[PDB]
Design a protein around this ligand. Structure first.
Ligand SMILES: Cc1oc(Cn2ccc3ccc(Br)cc32)cc1C(=O)O
Ligand SMILES: Cc1oc(Cn2ccc3ccc(Br)cc32)cc1C(=O)O
Ligand SMILES: Cc1oc(Cn2ccc3ccc(Br)cc32)cc1C(=O)O
Ligand SMILES: Cc1oc(Cn2ccc3ccc(Br)cc32)cc1C(=O)O
Ligand SMILES: *Cc1c(COP(=O)(O)O)cnc(C)c1O
Ligand SMILES: *Cc1c(COP(=O)(O)O)cnc(C)c1O
Ligand SMILES: *Cc1c(COP(=O)(O)O)cnc(C)c1O
Ligand SMILES: *Cc1c(COP(=O)(O)O)cnc(C)c1O
Ligand code: NA
Ligand code: NA
Ligand code: NA
Ligand code: NA
Ligand code: NA
Ligand code: NA
Ligand code: NA
Ligand code: NA
Lengths: 380, 380, 380, 380
C-alpha cells in the first residue's frame, strides 16, 4: 500500500524452502541438475543467475514499478551495460553535467567503440529535440544532477524519446525509488548507483537497473551474462538489508535538508545555495511535479578555497570522504576532489567555484547538523 | 622458494595494522581523508581500489610472476576488460575452439563495437601468422582448450605477437598458475576464471588478470575503474582463502587424472580420450615444455547419447553440474549442455559427438574415482 | 550530542589504518607477533579479542553510557555469562515473569550448579526487599516484561541492590539504549538480546552486555574468555550496521505503537490491552520516569483461540514468526507458541489467556498497520 | 568409501531447494510459520537451529561416525557445554596436562559450581582407575596432549568409563577426524576446537561436538539452546568449506612432519624431540593402534631462551603467532607464551624448559620447511 510498507513487503526477500524471514546468501557458483537440462529452481550457473541476486533484482523492480531487475558490480557497471545496448555509429544525448564517471566512461571508453555522445542542457527539453541526429538511439538524463542539482523534466523527456524512437534512461540515484519513479513517467530504463542511498551504509559498491520492457530486459540480461559485471551474493544481501530502511532514512534526511537550507540561506558567509527545494531554483515546479521529496545532496558557495577548508575543519558531525548516501553526513569541495581535472577558469565558468561546498545530509539529529554547520560557518 | 611455499607466503595476505594472519574483509565503499587529497593508505573509493581486492590482486600477480593484478566480477568480465583495450576497427586472432562465453561475448557484443575477430587453428602457429591482418592488435589463446584440450605453443605465440606488435593474452584457467606461467614465456597478459580452480570451492564467481607491463596495467586499471566490473571484498577474501590450497588440490587432481586416463584407455566402452598427458595427443611435447602438470578436465567418447546418460546415472561420486575446478568431481555432456546451440552435424564435424563426456576431476580419493567411473562404464 | 547523532558517531566504527568509514570484518583467529609477547595492536587470539567484536562492544558501551562492552553469541549466552559471576550457594532475585529462556536457563541449568533463584513480583520493590536472603548476591530485572509488559522501578531496584550488596542487572532488550539507560540509574550491568531491536533486521543472533564497573568488567571478560560464548566477526559487523538505524526505527515503531493502541482500545473485539504507554497501566508513571519512549511489543485480548487464529490469517502486513524487533511487524499467540508448556489453567491464572495476541510493531507505514489490524479485527 | 571421498561427500552440504552445490549461508534469526506450530522445514529460531549450522553439524557427525553434531562459538564453549552435563558435587578425571583453557575453565569457573576435578597421568590407565571416586561422573582426555604430546589409550579409557558408569569424552583436536575416531573406540563424546585443523585457515573460532548417544545428544542440545554458545551461520559455512581440504592438508602436514623430525633428531642444537611418531615415545604403540596418522604439532628442546628467540628470528617460513592448524607453519615458545603463568621451576619440573620450541607444521613445501628450520638451527 503506502511506501514504508512496500519497502518492507515488496519483492521476494524470504526463503520459500525454510521460511527464513531474510534472503539466504547463496555463496555458490553452480547448481546440481537432476537430469541433463532440468534445473531444480531455474539456477544452473551463478553468473547467469544467483538466488540472492534474484532477491535484490526483484526488490528494485518492485520499488520502481518495473518488471525486471538487474544487479551489477557497480553503478558504472550498470551504466556501461545500458550503453552497450547500442552499436558503433549510434548516438546518445545526455544532460550537460552528468556524473564524472559517466562522462569518463562515455568519452574515454565507449567513444573508442564508435558510440557518439553529445552533452546538452536538458533543463530546456527543446535542447534535446534540437540535439537529435538521424543516428540518435538513446536519451540518458540524471535528475537532479551533481553538484549543482539541475532538474530535467522526466515526463517530457520520455515523450520526446517515444516520439523519436529513443531508448530513454534515467539515472535515479540522487532521488531513490522512494521519491521519484521514472518508469511511471514513461521512461524505458531506470538505474542507480546502489552504492549510495539504496545500500545506504557506505559498505556496498553496486548498481541496479529496472525496466518494464520485456525486449530491453532480454537484451540487458544477455549483456549481463556475456560481459559479466554481476553483483555478488553477499553484496546483494547487504543491499536488500539496507533498502529495508530507505524510507526512514530518506525522511530523516529530508527533514534535516529543509532545516539546513533555511540556515544556509540566512547565513552571511554563504552565497548561492543549490537544491531543487528552493523555490527560485530552475525547474523547481518540474521537480515537484515528478518527485514527492528531495535528495540529500546540497551545494552552497562560501567565499574561497581557504573558507571551504576552514568550514570542513570546524565541523564536528560532517565527515570528509568521497561518495554520498551514507548514514553519516559527508562534506566535500568539488573543485579540489571530483573536478580538479578541469582547468580552474572552466570550473568557474560552470559554477564550480573554489568555495563551492557539497554536503550529503546523513541521518544524525537535525538540530545537531544545523547547529554544527552554523557554528562552523560562524568561524568564517 | 618452491611452489607450495609460494602459495602460502606469496602476496600480501595479512593485516599490517592488527597483525591478523588473514586479510580483513573491507565491506566498505569510501574512506576518511585527513585533509582534502591526502589518503591515509591510498584508498578513497572502493570501485577504484579496496584493500581486500588489493590482497587478491597481489596474490595473482605474485603467482603468475607479474607486477600487476586485477580482480573482476567474473571471468568474462576480465576477458571483456582485456578486449576493451582495443578500438573500433581493431582485429583479434583467437584459437578456433575458445570458451563459449568468450565466443559469445566477441561475436555478439564486441563485434557491434567494430572489433573484428577471426578464430583459427592455433595448434599450428603459422596459422596465426597467416591470419594476421594489417589491423590485428591482439592475439588471445586458451591452452588447453575446452572440451577437446587442444594445446597451443605459448612461447611461439608470444614471439609472433612481439614481432607483429600484438598484445598477447593467455586464458590460463585450465592450468592455473601452479602448472603454467604465460608471463614467463613472453605473454603480455594472463587471465583466469577464478570461478574454477583458483577459488576451487564452487562458491565464488570471479576473474583475475595479471601483467608485468606497466602501460597495459595502467590501461586495464583505467578500464576497470571506468566500466566497474570489480570483484567485491567478500569474494576477494574467499579467493585468497581458496588459493591457499591450490597446490595440494591440483596435485591430488593430477594423481587421479593419471589413473583415470589409464582406466579410460583400457575400457572397451570408451573410444577416443582427450587430454594433453596422452603421448599421442597433438602438441603433447609442447604442453610438457610449457607446463609441469596437467589440467583436471578430461573428455572421452562413449557410444551415443543413451550411453552418456546411463554413465552419468550409474556413478556415485560424479556430480552432474556446470563449471569445473570444484572439490567435487563434475560430469557433463557438452552436446546436451554447453554446445546444444550448435547444429548436431556441425557438432559431429568438430568432434563434439553425442556420446562425448567431459569430467572435471575433483579431490576425492583416486581409487574411488577410478573404480566408480569404471563400474559405471561396465554397465554399458 | 542528541541521540540520533550519538547513534552515528558514538563508538569506534571506522578503520584507523585505511580510513574505511565502516568497521572491517576481521574473519581471523590469530595475529602475528613481532616479538614474543609484543602484540601490534593488542590482539593475539580472536576468542580473547577480535577487532570487529571490539567495535560492537565499544558501540554498546557508548550507547548505554558504560565503559565496557561484551558481545556474546546470543542473548542467553550473555545472560549465562552474567549468572556465572556467582558461585554455588549464591541466590538471585528475578522478576516473576522473566523471559522463558532466562527462566529455563536458571531453573534447569544453573540450579544444578547450586545457584538458587526466586521469582517475585518486582512491580512493588518492597517485594524485592522481603525476598532478600543472607545468600542473595544478584538482582536481575526485565522492564517491561513479556508478554504483559509489567514495569519495574529501575532506580529503586538499584538503590535496594546498592544497600544490600547485590549486583544489579537489567535486561534492557525491550526498550533498547535509545529509550532507557539502566546504568544511568545506578544499575551495575545492562544486557540485551541484540537479536531483537539492536540488530533490528532478524538476521543476527547475539547478546550484548555493558557495565561501568571495572572489577565486574574484569570478571565478565574472564568468563567470556574461559567459557567462549563470543560473537563472531561477521555478526558483530551486522550488529554495528543495524544499530546505525536504531533511532529512526524505534521512532517509526513508536508512532505506530501509539496509533495501534488507540485503535485496539476502541475496537469491540479487543478487551484488555497491555502496554506501558496506557495511563491506567501499573507503574506507568515509573516507566515514564525511567524511559523517554516505548517498546514496540503490545499484547491484547481477543475472545478465544479461534478468534486469535482468524486474526492472524486475516492480516496482510503481520507476519507469523517467533522473536521481536524486526523491520517486519510480527504476530503471535503466546499460549500456543511460547507458553504452551504451562498448563492451561495456570496460563489463565497468570493472564496468558487463549486469545492473548502479541504483536511486535515493525516499521511499515503507520496507517497501513492500523488499518490492516482493524479490518482483521472487524472479521471477528 | 575412502577418507578423501568421505570428506567431499559425507554430510549434507548442498541446497535441496535450488541445488546449489554449497550450503547457503542463512544469515537469519527467525522463520515464517504457515500455521501456529507448523514449521516448514523444522526451523523456528536460529539459536535453537539454523540450516547452515545444521550443515556443519551433519559434517562433524559423519566424519566422526556419530549420529549427532553440535557447533559452538569456540572450542572452550563446546568443552563448557560438555562439562555442564554434570551437577554440583560431580567429579571429573582429566589427563594431567590438559589444554590451558580447559584447565582454567575447570579450576576457575566450574569449580565454583561444585564440580570437582582431578588431573592425573592417564598415560597409565590404571591411574584413571585409582582416581575414580564414588562421585566421578566423567572422564575427559586429550590425546596427544600439548605441548609434550603425551598419548592416552582411548579404547581402554572407554572400557574403564563404561565399567564405572562414566561419560567418556575425548578432545580430538590435535588428530582431527581424519586420523583418529574416538566414537569408534567406545567413547561417548568427541569434541574439537574447529579453530585449528578443521577450519584450517586461521579464520574461524569454533567448537564441534559429536556423539552417537541419543540421550547425551538430547542433553547437549538442551544445554546449547539454554546457554546459547552457538556457532553463527557465516562461521559454520567457512568451517564446511575448510573441512573440504582437511585430508589433503593433513597428508601434506604429515609428510613434512616426518622429514622435519628426521632433521630435528639429527641436528646437534636440538635435544629431546616430542612427537608420537618417534618409536621411543611413551605409548607410541598405543597411538599407532588408535590413529592412522599424526598431528602436526611437534615440540623440541634447544639450549635456552636466547637460542629459542634466535631460532624464531632466523626462520623465513615459520610464523610467530598463537593457535595451531593453520595453512602457515607456526612457531612458539610455551614458557614465554602459553605457560608463562607457571613459576619457572615448576615449568622445568614438567618439561616445559626455557628452550622448548613448539612448531605447528603447515602446508608449505616439505623441503622448504626442513631446510629453513635447519639453517635457522645452524645459526645456533
Ligand atoms: C568530475 C567530472 O565531471 C565531468 C564533466 N565534464 C566534462 C567536461 C567538463 C568541463 C567542465 C566541467 Br565543470 C565539467 C566537465 C568530467 C569529469 C572528469 O572527471 O573528467
Ligand atoms: C559453447 C559454444 O562454443 C562455441 C564456439 N563455436 C562457435 C561456432 C561453432 C561451431 C561449432 C562448434 Br563445435 C563450436 C562453435 C560457441 C558456443 C555458443 O554457446 O554459442
Ligand atoms: C515461556 C516460559 O515462561 C516461563 C515462566 N514461568 C515459569 C513457571 C510459570 C508458570 C506460569 C507461567 Br504463565 C509462566 C511461568 C517459563 C517458560 C518455559 O518455557 O518453560
Ligand atoms: C597453559 C596452562 O597450562 C596449565 C596446566 N597446569 C595447571 C597447573 C600447572 C602446573 C605446571 C604446568 Br607445566 C602446567 C599446569 C594451566 C595453564 C594456565 O594458563 O594457567
Ligand atoms: C502497497 C504495496 C504494493 C503496491 O505499491 P504501489 O505503489 O501501489 O504500486 C506492492 N507491494 C507491496 C508489498 C505493497 O504493500
Ligand atoms: C619462493 C618464493 C617466491 C619466489 O618464487 P619464484 O617461482 O622463484 O619466482 C616468492 N614469494 C615467496 C613467498 C616465496 O616463498
Ligand atoms: C552527543 C554525543 C555523545 C554524548 O552523549 P550523552 O548522551 O550526552 O552521554 C557521545 N558520543 C557522540 C558521538 C555524541 O555525538
Ligand atoms: C565411504 C563413505 C562413507 C562411509 O565411511 P566409513 O568410514 O566407511 O564409515 C560415508 N559417506 C560417504 C559420502 C562416503 O563416501
Ligand atoms: Na516481501
Ligand atoms: Na514503458
Ligand atoms: Na604473504
Ligand atoms: Na613482458
Ligand atoms: Na564513531
Ligand atoms: Na555504577
Ligand atoms: Na554430501
Ligand atoms: Na557409544
Amino acid at each position: 500500500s503506502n511506501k514504508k510498507t512496500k519497502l518492507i513487503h515488496g519483492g521476494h526477500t524470504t526463503d520459500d524452502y525454510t521460511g527464513a524471514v531474510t534472503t539466504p546468501i547463496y555463496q555458490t557458483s553452480t547448481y546440481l541438475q537432476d537430469d541433463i537440462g532440468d534445473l531444480r529452481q531455474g539456477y544452473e550457473y551463478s553468473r547467469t543467475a544467483n538466488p540472492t541476486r534474484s532477491s535484490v533484482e526483484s526488490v528494485i523492480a518492485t520499488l520502481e514499478n518495473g518488471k525486471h531487475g538487474f544487479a551489477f558490480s557497480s553503478g558504472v557497471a550498470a551504466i556501461s551495460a545500458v550503453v552497450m545496448l547500442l552499436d558503433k555509429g549510434d548516438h546518445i544525448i545526455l544532460n550537460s553535467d552528468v556524473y564524472g564517471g559517466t562522462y569518463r566512461a562515455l568519452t574515454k571508453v565507449f567513444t573508442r567503440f564508435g558510440i557518439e555522445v553529445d552533452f546538452v542542457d536538458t533543463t530546456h527539453t527543446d535542447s534535446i529535440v534540437q540535439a537529435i541526429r538521424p543516428t540518435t538511439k538513446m536519451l540518458f538524463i540524471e535528475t537532479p544532477s551533481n553538484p549543482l542539482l539541475r532538474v530535467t523534466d522526466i515526463k517530457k523527456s520520455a515523450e520526446i524519446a517515444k516520439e523519436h524512437g529513443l531508448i530513454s534512461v534515467v539515472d535515479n540515484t540522487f532521488m531513490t525509488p522512494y521519491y521519484q519513479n521514472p518508469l511511471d513517467l514513461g521512461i524505458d530504463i531506470v538505474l542507480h548507483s546502489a552504492t549510495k542511498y539504496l545500500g545506504g551504509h557506505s559498505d556496498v559498491v553496486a548498481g541496479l537497473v529496472a525496466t518494464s520492457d520485456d525486449k530491453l530486459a532480454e537484451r540487458l540480461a544477455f549483456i549481463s551474462n556475456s560481459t559479466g559485471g554481476i553483483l555478488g551474493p553477499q553484496d546483494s544481501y547487504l543491499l536488500v538489508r539496507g533498502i529495508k530502511t530507505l524510507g526512514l532514512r530518506m525522511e530523516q534526511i529530508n527533514r534535516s535538508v529543509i532545516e539546513i537550507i533555511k540556515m544556509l540561506q540566512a547565513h552571511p558567509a554563504v552565497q548561492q545555495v543549490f537544491h531543487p527545494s528552493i523555490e527560485s531554483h530552475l525547474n523547481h515546479d518540474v521537480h515537484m511535479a515528478q518527485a514527492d521529496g528531495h535528495t540529500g545532496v546540497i551545494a552552497f558557495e562560501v567565499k574561497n578555497t581557504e573558507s571551504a577548508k576552514q568550514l570542513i575543519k570546524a565541523t564536528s558531525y560532517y565527515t570528509l570522504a568521497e561518495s554520498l548516501g551514507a548514514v553519516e553526513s559527508l562534506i566535500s569541495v568539488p573543485a579540489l576532489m571530483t573536478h580538479a581535472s578541469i582547468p580552474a577558469d572552466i570550473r568557474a565558468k560552470e559554477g564550480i567555484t573554489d568555495g563551492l561546498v557539497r554536503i550529503s545530509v546523513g541521518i544524525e539529529d537535525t538540530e545537531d547538523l544545523v547547529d554544527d554547520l552554523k557554528q562552523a560557518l560562524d568561524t568564517l
